Amino acid sequence: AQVSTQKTGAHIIHYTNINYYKDAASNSANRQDFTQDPSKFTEPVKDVMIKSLPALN
Amino acid sequence: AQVSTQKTGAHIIHYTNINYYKDAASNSANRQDFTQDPSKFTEPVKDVMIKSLPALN
Amino acid sequence: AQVSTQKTGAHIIHYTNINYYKDAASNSANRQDFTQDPSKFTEPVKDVMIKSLPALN
Amino acid sequence: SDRVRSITLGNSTITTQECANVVVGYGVWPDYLSDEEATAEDQPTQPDVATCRFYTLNSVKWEMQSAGWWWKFPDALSEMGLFGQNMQYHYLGRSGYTIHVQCNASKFHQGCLLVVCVPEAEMGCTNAENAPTYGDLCGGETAKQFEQNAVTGETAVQTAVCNAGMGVGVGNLTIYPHQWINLRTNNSATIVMPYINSVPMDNMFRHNNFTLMIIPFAPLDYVTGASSYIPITVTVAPMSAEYNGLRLAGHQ
Amino acid sequence: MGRVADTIARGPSNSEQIPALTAVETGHTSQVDPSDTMQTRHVHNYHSRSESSIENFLCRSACVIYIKYSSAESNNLKRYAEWVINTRQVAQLRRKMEMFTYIRCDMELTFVITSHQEMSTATNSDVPVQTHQIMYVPPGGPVPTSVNDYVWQTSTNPSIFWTEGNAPPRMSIPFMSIGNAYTMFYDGWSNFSRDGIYGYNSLNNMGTIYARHVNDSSPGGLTSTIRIYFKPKHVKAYVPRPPRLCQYKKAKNVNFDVEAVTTERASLVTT
Amino acid sequence: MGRVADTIARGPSNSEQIPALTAVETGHTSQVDPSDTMQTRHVHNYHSRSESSIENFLCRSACVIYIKYSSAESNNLKRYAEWVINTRQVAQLRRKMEMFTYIRCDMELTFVITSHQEMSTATNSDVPVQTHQIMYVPPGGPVPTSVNDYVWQTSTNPSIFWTEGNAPPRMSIPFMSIGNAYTMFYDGWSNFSRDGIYGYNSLNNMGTIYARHVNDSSPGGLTSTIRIYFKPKHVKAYVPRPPRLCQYKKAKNVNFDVEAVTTERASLVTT
Amino acid sequence: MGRVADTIARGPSNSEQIPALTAVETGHTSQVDPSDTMQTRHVHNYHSRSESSIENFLCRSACVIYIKYSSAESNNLKRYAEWVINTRQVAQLRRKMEMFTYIRCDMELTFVITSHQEMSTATNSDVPVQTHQIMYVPPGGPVPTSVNDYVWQTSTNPSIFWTEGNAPPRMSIPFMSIGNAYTMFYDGWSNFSRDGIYGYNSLNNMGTIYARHVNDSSPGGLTSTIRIYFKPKHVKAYVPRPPRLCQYKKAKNVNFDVEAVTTERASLVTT
Amino acid sequence: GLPTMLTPGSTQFLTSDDFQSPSAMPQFDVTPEMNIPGQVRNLMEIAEVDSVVPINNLQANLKTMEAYRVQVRSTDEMGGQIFGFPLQPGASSVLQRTLLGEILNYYTHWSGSLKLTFVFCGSAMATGKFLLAYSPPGAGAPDSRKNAMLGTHVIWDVGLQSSCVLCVPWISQTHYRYVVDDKYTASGFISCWYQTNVIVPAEAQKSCYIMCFVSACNDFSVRMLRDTQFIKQDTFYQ
Amino acid sequence: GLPTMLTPGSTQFLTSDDFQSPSAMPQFDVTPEMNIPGQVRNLMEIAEVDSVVPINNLQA
Amino acid sequence: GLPTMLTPGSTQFLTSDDFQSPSAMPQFDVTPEMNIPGQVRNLMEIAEVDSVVPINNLQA
Numbered sequence A, B, C: 001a002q003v004s005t006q007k008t009g010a011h012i013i014h015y016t017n018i019n020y021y022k023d024a025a026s027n028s029a030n031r032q033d034f035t036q037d038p039s040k041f042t043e044p045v046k047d048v049m050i051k052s053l054p055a056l057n
Numbered sequence D: 001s002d003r004v005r006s007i008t009l010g011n012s013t014i015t016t017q018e019c020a021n022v023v024v025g026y027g028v029w030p031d032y033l034s035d036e037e038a039t040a041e042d043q044p045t046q047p048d049v050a051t052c053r054f055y056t057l058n059s060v061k062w063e064m065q066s067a068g069w070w071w072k073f074p075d076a077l078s079e080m081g082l083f084g085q086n087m088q089y090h091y092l093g094r095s096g097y098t099i100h101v102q103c104n105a106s107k108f109h110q111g112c113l114l115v116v117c118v119p120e121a122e123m124g125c126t127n128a129e130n131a132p133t134y135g136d137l138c139g140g141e142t143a144k145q146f147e148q149n150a151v152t153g154e155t156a157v158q159t160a161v162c163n164a165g166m167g168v169g170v171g172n173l174t175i176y177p178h179q180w181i182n183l184r185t186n187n188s189a190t191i192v193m194p195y196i197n198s199v200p201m202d203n204m205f206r207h208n209n210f211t212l213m214i215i216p217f218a219p220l221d222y223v224t225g226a227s228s229y230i231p232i233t234v235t236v237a238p239m240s241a242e243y244n245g246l247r248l249a250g251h252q
Numbered sequence E, F, G: 001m002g003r004v005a006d007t008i009a010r011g012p013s014n015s016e017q018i019p020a021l022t023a024v025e026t027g028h029t030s031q032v033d034p035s036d037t038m039q040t041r042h043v044h045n046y047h048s049r050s051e052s053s054i055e056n057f058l059c060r061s062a063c064v065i066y067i068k069y070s071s072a073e074s075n076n077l078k079r080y081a082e083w084v085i086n087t088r089q090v091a092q093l094r095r096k097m098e099m100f101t102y103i104r105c106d107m108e109l110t111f112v113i114t115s116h117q118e119m120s121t122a123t124n125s126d127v128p129v130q131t132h133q134i135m136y137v138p139p140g141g142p143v144p145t146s147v148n149d150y151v152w153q154t155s156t157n158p159s160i161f162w163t164e165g166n167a168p169p170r171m172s173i174p175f176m177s178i179g180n181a182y183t184m185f186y187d188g189w190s191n192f193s194r195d196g197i198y199g200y201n202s203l204n205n206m207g208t209i210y211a212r213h214v215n216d217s218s219p220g221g222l223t224s225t226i227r228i229y230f231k232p233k234h235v236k237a238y239v240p241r242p243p244r245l246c247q248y249k250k251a252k253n254v255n256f257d258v259e260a261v262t263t264e265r266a267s268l269v270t271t
Numbered sequence H: 001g002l003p004t005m006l007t008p009g010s011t012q013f014l015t016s017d018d019f020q021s022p023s024a025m026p027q028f029d030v031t032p033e034m035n036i037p038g039q040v041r042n043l044m045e046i047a048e049v050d051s052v053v054p055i056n057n058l059q060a061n062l063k064t065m066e067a068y069r070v071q072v073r074s075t076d077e078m079g080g081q082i083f084g085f086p087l088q089p090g091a092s093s094v095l096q097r098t099l100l101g102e103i104l105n106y107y108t109h110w111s112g113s114l115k116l117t118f119v120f121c122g123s124a125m126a127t128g129k130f131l132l133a134y135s136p137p138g139a140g141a142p143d144s145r146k147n148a149m150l151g152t153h154v155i156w157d158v159g160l161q162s163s164c165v166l167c168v169p170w171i172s173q174t175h176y177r178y179v180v181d182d183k184y185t186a187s188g189f190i191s192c193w194y195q196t197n198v199i200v201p202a203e204a205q206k207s208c209y210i211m212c213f214v215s216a217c218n219d220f221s222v223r224m225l226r227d228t229q230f231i232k233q234d235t236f237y238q
Numbered sequence I, J: 001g002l003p004t005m006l007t008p009g010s011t012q013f014l015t016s017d018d019f020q021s022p023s024a025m026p027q028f029d030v031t032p033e034m035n036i037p038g039q040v041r042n043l044m045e046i047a048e049v050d051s052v053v054p055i056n057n058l059q060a
């Protein structure tokens, strides 16, 4: 059994999941992975550009 | 698992709940919260009025 | 309860099985046994033949 | 200053004295394939400096009514040096690139270009029952041209910048590795594309990993009595080129 | 968590720092916050990007086709139906996946199978509850040519048997591309010549679904229609693309008709 | 626990203490017990206020609408039905919520879907078990204009598929107001001008439910009627209001007709 | 795990080692890798032989027969049906098992039972939901001669009772050969004389399935058809054989018609 | 068996559920993962990237490249308003087919600040100053440059740095706004004015262009998935 | 599967039940709570407040 | 009984599933195993064995 926090607010709060199958494709979708890395689209530059400085010196 | 007392009389008496979902909106309603504070409607006065004393001295 | 790894990739990942019957013929098929021994068909020779050497000296 | 740069690859070197940084597409720098991501079991040839080195393509004339240009890769380098020779003799290849666009002007000229490398830039067709043919997708070292307005044909590529030749907003080609060349700022763009595919290696004639598109977003304009010929030159070097599946030359 | 940035308190400034000024000739886009362009208070911000994950965006079941078949063969539907698997015959699901160039995912296939009575010159109908088979035939398998043939024995072919009046049946499918991700857009050809099929349809070869009534035909006629629903699960997506601007024409091409960027306005200044 | 106060034993008194006398010109209301106005015994009192919690009061499913649709389109019901979500078309559920000004809660939506045979000139009916779709379309989504259109593909729109002869289907809905609580009464307007819609209907924008038969029409006709039930859960309510005195007129206004405070009596003294 | 061998890096060679040269006059087959015939790089290889196990190959349900029976006895189907148990009346399942000489396994039997209305001169049908019995009679048990006889009391005979509109019924069967494995091919005879039945049918004696409607016949007619599905489980197989080349003729013989080894080519050199 | 009781929604197919279901290819061995550049994990990694904004989307300019550029010139007066549009990044004609705006039309709610970058695409001998303004709503769009500078603004000075960002802050009564236009959820107005003039030599062009870009800030989020209204079909594609 | 048996009231919709049901907006992020004056938790906080009584409720 | 809810695919017969089902011969005593030469455990033990190739497969 895997016990993991629920999505809850803002200002019990766990659920239990047991996998019933021998394949990991059978498992319920992972909806609680909230990792991000926007910098490879938003800042894809060789030299690190500091915000307060000129872009082009 | 959460083990909590049942509603019972007056002059076994527990139940077990396991949450099966990843959201807290999916959970059964909280019916056993009996907290109160009637004083913000019933006594909403700046100065504390003592019952035995005059209201207005 | 028997807890065993699921089939998963490549570069949670366990499941739980409980048997509900008194016979082992009632059980789900064993799909995760990957033992092999091809040498009794592929190399069924009395004298061990070393690959780098002549077959017949 | 941040405006001066050199890039040396092989026996070639490029210099800039106005540039707006270098874009490393998706933050990943070219490298050879690892042993844990491989699937071709023969030894890879890595010609190093002999294939990795700038190759200047045919220049295009920027006009006031130009709507843009595109070159598909690896098929713009298919006749270029030993990079193009190793394409002939090998089933598989795999290469990253540094793409460098040059377009200088005076300070009395104005215009703005989008320089963008689009992975998997599959293109539409004028007739909706037909696929575009190779001659209309690719010109080799010569660019194929976008048109201002819709075109007709049977196997012609539907060209019309607004759709970008792909049926999408042309203004949204900015989630792809890109730089702008604005004539009042910089005279060069540099993009470094890693190898991007969903297979670790692939044939170099049957597939185009990305397309470089150069699209005017602010027309060329200058007062008559100034230079009226302004080229755009694209000079592009392979990086970490390696090939597997050696056999006789051809591709049919 | 997926919680967003807090606003940071900021006072008056007068310095040679220039967060507002930038060059967009770099591929880099500005990182400015409100805390760089005006006063601002501190706001502790609890908002989350939880539902804007790609595994919540793509993880809702979408109809990809429906196909009909008839016991009577009333209106040219045969006694079985077929569908070459693809995701490109529906606009809505297709567009969501085409915001990415490569996707690897598992699928979950749910089937919503319904039947209806047909007009007939038959009198007296008391037709039993229908059972239906849904058979998946991997590439290069034998195919039905009739409802009665040997291919419906399903000796190695995956198959569902389901009876009406029950919950919709579903099965998971794993990731199963030849490649290391599914390819939404292919700028190549299927030949080294550079002829043949061009586009993503070169790499499409995902088998065929067949569906029949298992029950023998009754004196009236029933047509059954099966709607197929795919839900991505366990997704990783790579290389973002623009959302589509143009309406699609074809399920094997991207061919498009030239369409407007945006809708009209009266002038530059509107209120 | 929610247990009430015990009565406290009290003897004769004669003092300058005056619990009975008070001024009601204060907003304060008297705190007097029986133990202040007469003798009284000690009563250990075990009674609870358990079921008078707001999370037991509001937490019973109440019908909020029903809407009808017909396979034949017999009596102008179309082949699908629609309902703009609100809680104000029913007197009973509305009144309970309007004893509060602001409520934040989760909902639980249960649907009770029934069908009936219609008069027809058709002969011989043996219509399969109906399947039905219930689609929720968030604000600014595409809407059905027919039963067959692309909107019922439900690629991102939440949807239920359910077959007759099974348990009523239900789904939870979370709290989802733009504000930090739902607003039962709004004394404002939707314009800064102070024109347009006035009242709580300014802030109402909760999407639209659509429901259809998924099965193709059969030679007779069936009308299906779907009854929608909302149950508040996990409630916090704020700012108590009087219960309604007057009957409602409209589901978007509070307009009312002038009505009596209480019922008649013959005189001041009645037995 | 079932993971396959990695490729090992290899340089130029020039030695008296000869991995390529071998004699095939030995029963031994060469063990050469690519790392013996050309350069090669190191490839860490994660591919698995997981689904090529014999317990995944044989472990998918395959139809082995279907048999029909009729309430009315409309078209000579009687009121009950029978089938002498064997695995050899279907090509697909038979071929998979005949790639082995001896197999011991447990089975899982699933039944897919359907019914259909028949033509009749009857008017007004409102036939209740059918119930069906499936009775297994071990060798040397009493057998049905009618639908009403004493044999359907099932006092020791294993039996399933199942009603339409429910999930397909299944039961496990254990390994149950007289021998220590089932025999797919028997090169003997059933007599010491060397007469009588020749082949594997000598050792076949696996009882008989009988199936009837449990409900009494109604004024119309219903035919029910029951499809029987066997899935091997817990398998051990011994002595690999060639897959079949020829189509089968008979379910008790291997008799075959002479057929081509492979399909045509134009010449020795083709592209 | 074990005593159980079925509860409402026992046989439903909800399209937003996640449940486990048996695989139809048991023990299938998937292809190994490899690193493919540009992995997306969130759609706010697409929304925070700049996208050219069609601020000149008049009827003639829709299918041309005129859409994405607004002319600015050397005026003989002060010069008036250059453009203005109601802010609403998912319902405005200007902003709703950008990357930010098409990721917004899969959602019903949004919150947070966004940033409008502007770039001068004149000559390097051309120079100007512009007032980039945001006005919170409840007093209409500014009809003078005086009323525009009572709002939030950045005065842009054209120089070596070719671009200037007007970051437009969240400023809202509610924690979220609707993607759809709603009068309660009104989001303000954007405008641009001449602060000085475009001043340029004789031998350099009097007219120049300006482009606008839009992207989300790092405080931006969206809620409540829904079908987009921008794609449709009348029959299955073949 | 696991042997189970259904008991009376297996498919009923009781309107006073409380059971769990899947959310139709999985992973939805609700608005933060704030303190709104005058939170009610019980209806005996409304009943214990004075209310003017119509003791002269004749027809006119 | 215990509150439960049925989910899609509750009554399906998938032919590639593996589930437990009651035996129809409870407490049946199977024949002892013995070693039979040539046990196969994988079909890559058959595929790795040489097989004569018809490279001259013309019509005659």
Ligand SMILES: CCCOc1ccc2cc(S(=O)(=O)Nc3ccc(C(=O)O)cc3)ccc2c1
Pocket: E063, E065, E066, E090, E227, F148, F149, F150, F151, F152, F153, H233, H234, H235, H236, H237
């Ligand atoms: C009777 C002859 C056939 O008539 C029509 C009429 C209208 C059609 C519209 C479409 S669509 O909008 O492109 N796609 C849909 C997908 C799924 C659903 C569903 O119901 O889930 C609905 C529509 C497809 C086929 C159509 C056939």
